[PDB]
Amino acid sequence: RQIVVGICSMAKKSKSKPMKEILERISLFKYITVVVFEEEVILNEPVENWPLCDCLISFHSKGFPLDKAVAYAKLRNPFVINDLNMQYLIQDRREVYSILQAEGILLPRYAILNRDPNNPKECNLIEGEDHVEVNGEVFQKPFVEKPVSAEDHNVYIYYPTSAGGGSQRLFRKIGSRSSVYSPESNVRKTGSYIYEEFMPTDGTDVKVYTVGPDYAHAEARKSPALDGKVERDSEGKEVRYPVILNAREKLIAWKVCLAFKQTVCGFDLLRANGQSYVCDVNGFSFVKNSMKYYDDCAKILGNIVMRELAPQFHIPWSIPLEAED
């Protein structure tokens, strides 16, 4: 019989252009059949009724029942490409930074302010005009304030008096904008936040996309922290700049991929002070608008599948050579 690769995610994701491009390519593997789980089934049917697969590619996004995906994997025991339990932790920035620290990965100096919604002022924060103190730890402006939920993209940056004060409020892109300036100089007074040192970059963020630990595509984009106008090309796509990762950064990608057990993994790097700091780990993420990535990603995932399962299915398989970039 064919090896079945099951795709389990919200329709918005499973039906996206990158997914469709990759799935048609994986389907070219002679011994692999692709089955995309319908959203109505994922949301409404018990896991006992979900289709069978031998290899499961499943990932959480807004609205996805991760509890069900976990239960399905427990029931059927398929080969899992992106670890499901780690996807709970990826939703919590505190858990993400904790794992990065444990792996010896450079990240901005940070402190967590956990606030009890019942006693919002009993928390360990002291505010000055040009600094905050979080559990005793001082952060001079400029500093970054992030919601503990990784799914809340309302990240704020606070500027020093020497720069005009105020704050930059970041958010999920709306049309042509990704952030806006506010005259507000005081930090948010409700919610729990991570406070971290602002890393001076050249004005771009490096986005890294892994396919297993030995492949990473990188590209750069204007930092939303800069002014908030999104740069677009003549076709309306966000402008992307070429990046090649150095040896240190290739090791970062290897470490992130394995530490979070996400074969397909996106994360963000800040090139600052001669080093590269991880500021965000997003989990499952494809490169968009790159035919070469489509080819490479599909080939690598197909090969991972065959490597793991070909012996079980008595299929001859000789492990092939793959790109790293």
Ligand X SMILES: Nc1ncnc2c1ncn2[C@@H]1O[C@H](COP(=O)(O)OP(=O)(O)NP(=O)(O)O)[C@@H](O)[C@H]1O
Q: Which of 61, 91, 124, 303 binds ligand 0EJ (CB under 6 A)?
A: 61
Window of 29-37, 96-104, 184-192, 211-219 that interacts with Mg ion by CB under 5 A: 29-37
Selection from ligand 0EJ, ligand X, Mg ion, none that 32 binds (CB < 5 to 8 A by kind) is: Mg ion
Using the contact rule CB under 6 A, the part of the chain among 9-17, 27-35, 55-63, 277-285 near ligand X is 277-285
Contacting ligand X within 74-113 (CB under 6 A): 108
* Residue 254 CA, distance from chain mean position: 14
SS3 34: strand
Distance CA 149, CA 41 (A): 28
Contact 146, 157 (CB under 8 A): no
How do strand 156-158 and strand 137-140 relate by DSSP bridges? unpaired
Query: Any known ligand binding at 93?
Result: yes
Q: CB 163 → ligand 0EJ: shortest distance, Å?
A: 27
* Cis peptide bond prior to 213, omega within 30° of 0: no
For residue 196, say whether it is annotated as part of any ligand binding site: yes
- Indicate which of Mg ion, ligand 0EJ, ligand X, none lies near residue 155 (CB less than 5 to 8 Å, by partner kind): ligand X
Is residue 1 part of the contact set for ligand 0EJ (CB under 6 A)?
A: no
Closest distance of CB 46 from Mg ion, Å: 25
| Residue ranges of E strands in 14-81 | 32-36, 55-58, 79-80
Return the residues of window 260-279 that contact ligand 0EJ according to CB under 6 A: 266
Among residue numbers 13 through 52, which ones bind ligand X (CB under 6 A)? none
Q: For residues 194 and 146, is the Cβ–Cβ distance under 8 A?
A: yes
Q: How far, in Å, CA of 296 to CA of 298, rounded?
A: 6
User: For residues 219 and 287, is the Cβ–Cβ distance under 8 A?
Assistant: yes
Q: Which stretch binds ligand X (CB under 6 A): 72-80, 196-204, 294-302, 303-311?
A: 196-204
Which residue in 27, 282, 290, 303 binds ligand X (CB under 6 A)?
Answer: 282
Q: Which of 78, 213, 224, 228 binds ligand X (CB under 6 A)?
A: 224
Residue 185 CB-density burial (10 A; 0-12 exposed, 13-18 middle, 19+ buried): middle
User: Binding site annotation covers 207?
Assistant: yes
User: Burial level of 288, CB count in 10 A (0-12/13-18/19+)?
Assistant: middle
- 238 binding Mg ion? (CB under 5 A): no
| Residues 6 or more apart in contact with residue 280 via CB below 8 angstroms | 96, 150, 267, 268
Q: Which residues are annotated binding-site positions for ATP?
A: 93, 146, 153, 172, 196-199, 205-207, 223, 268, 280-282
Provide the binding-site residues for ligand X, judged by CB under 6 A: 108, 144, 146, 150, 153, 155, 170, 196-199, 205, 223-225, 268, 270, 279-280, 282
Provide the binding-site residues for Mg ion, judged by CB under 5 A: 27, 29, 32, 268, 280, 282
